[PDB]
């Protein structure tokens, strides 16, 4: 039935958020479209935490379609925790109108994590297997009612960081170059699949063997097992800064190795410019350490990603 495009705005390569409207008449929120979770929630008026006061809060009093459902919601994103209550209301994402969509309305958001974040809420795009009890992921409702023309969505993130796009129910050949390589999903919870090897110059330095990796648009870095990451941090030239981090000499870029992920028989290199992030006069390393690899924005900025729920496939194509 439909195709929606949502322009994303980026809080400096760390979050990839967009506008959604909730309630009748609609109230506006900015949300993080999150392929590593499946729950949808926005702050409410019942939330008194400072983070809530520094953001948009849903006022059910002004919505003619709201309906409390009462069921609790606790989501523990390491970073910060969020407590709320489930309810129902209409959501609008571009032109696609998603009626009686369950949505979490925070009640407590303690801590600084959420205060300083640029989004108001999180909209979960992983499998229903991940979603909290009584919560129905937004794409699943869209799908279930033939609201999208195809049961796929597509992520374009711009490295030049200004025309980032989420496309619902469509693939756009103009944001990629070459062909799409379809990779099957091994475990349907996150968007998970099998990487064959991580090599530097024909030498395998991580994931010796095969390893599982998830495609998470809600993680900024490339995250891996710390043994494998440490070796990658030596290999590229990365040192630990006093702050507990890994820095790279910004003027050393030209000589640093390219890192290659071999996914289902194709190679997806990561150039130095691609895994090297520079803010102000200092440069930091893209790779971070936690068994499962998390291919964050570092990889998705380079590879236009299609998430296909009809077929349970990930499709990768080099980003433009």
Description:
- With 320 residues, the chain is mostly beta strands.
- It has 2 domains: 3-171, Acid Proteases (Cathepsin D, subunit A, domain 1, Beta Barrel); 172-319, Beta Barrel (Cathepsin D, subunit A, domain 1).
- Helices cover 11% and strands 48% of the residues.
- The protein has 6 helices and 25 strands.
- It has helices spanning 50-53, 112-116, 138-144, 226-236, 272-275, 297-300; strands at 4-11, 15-22, 27-34, 40-43, 67-77, 80-93, 96-108, 121-124, 152-156, 164-168, 176-184, 192-200, 203-206, 211-215, 222-224, 239-241, 245-248, 259-263, 266-270, 276-279, 282-285, 287-289, 293-295, 303-308, 313-319.
- The strands form 3 sheets. Strands 12, 13, 14, 15, 18, 19, 22 and 23 form an 8-stranded mixed β-sheet that branches.
- A hairpin with a 2-residue loop joins strand 18 and strand 19.
- The longest helix is centred in the last third of the chain and has 11 residues, at 226-236.
- 43% of the residues are buried.
What is the CATH topology descriptor of the largest domain? Answer: Cathepsin D, subunit A, domain 1
Quickly count the helices.
6
Output the CATH class name of the largest domain.
Mainly Beta
Rg is: 20 Å
How many structural domains does the protein architecture include? 2
CATH superfamily of the largest domain: Acid Proteases
Strand portion: over 45%
Active site: 34, 216
Function: Chymosin is synthesized in the mucosa of the abomasum (fourth stomach) of young (unweaned) ruminants. The enzyme hydrolyzes casein to paracasein.
GO biological process, one term: digestion
Disulfide bonds: 47-52, 207-211, 250-283
């Amino acid at each position: 039935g439909e195709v929606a495009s949502v322009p994303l705005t980026n809080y400096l390569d760390s979050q990839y958020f967009g506008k959604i409207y909730l309630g009748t008449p609609p109230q506006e929120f900015t949300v993080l479209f999150d392929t590593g979770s499946s729950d949808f929630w926005v702050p409410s008026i019942y939330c008194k935490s400072n983070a809530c006061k520094n953001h948009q809060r849903f006022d059910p009093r002004k919505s003619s379609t709201f309906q409390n459902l009462g069921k609790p919601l606790s989501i523990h994103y390491g970073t910060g925790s969020m407590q709320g209550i489930l309810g129902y209301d209409t959501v609008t994402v571009s032109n696609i109108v998603d009626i009686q969509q369950t949505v979490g309305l925070s009640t407590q958001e303690p801590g600084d994590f959420f205060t300083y974040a640029e989004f108001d809420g999180i909209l979960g795009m992983a499998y229903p297997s991940l979603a909290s009890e009584y919560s129905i992921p937004v794409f699943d409702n869209m799908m279930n009612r033939h609201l999208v023309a195809q049961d796929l969505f597509s992520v374009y993130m711009d490295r030049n960081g200004q025309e980032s796009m989420l496309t619902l129910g469509a693939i756009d050949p103009s944001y990629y170059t070459g062909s799409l390589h379809w990779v099957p999903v091994t475990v349907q919870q996150y968007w998970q699949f099998t990487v064959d090897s991580v090599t530097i110059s024909g030498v395998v330095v991580a994931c010796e063997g095969g390893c599982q990796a998830i495609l998470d648009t809600g993680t900024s870095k490339l995250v891996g097992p710390s043994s494998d990451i440490l070796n990658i941090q030596q290999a590229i030239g990365a040192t630990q800064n006093q702050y507990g981090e890994f820095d790279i000499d910004c003027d050393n870029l030209s000589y640093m190795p390219t890192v290659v992920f071999e996914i289902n028989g194709k190679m997806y290199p990561l150039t130095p410019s691609a895994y090297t992030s520079q803010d102000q006069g200092f440069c930091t390393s893209g790779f971070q350490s936690e068994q499962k690899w998390i291919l964050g924005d570092v990889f998705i900025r380079e590879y236009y990603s299609v998430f296909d729920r009809a077929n349970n496939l990930v499709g990768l194509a080099k980003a433009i």
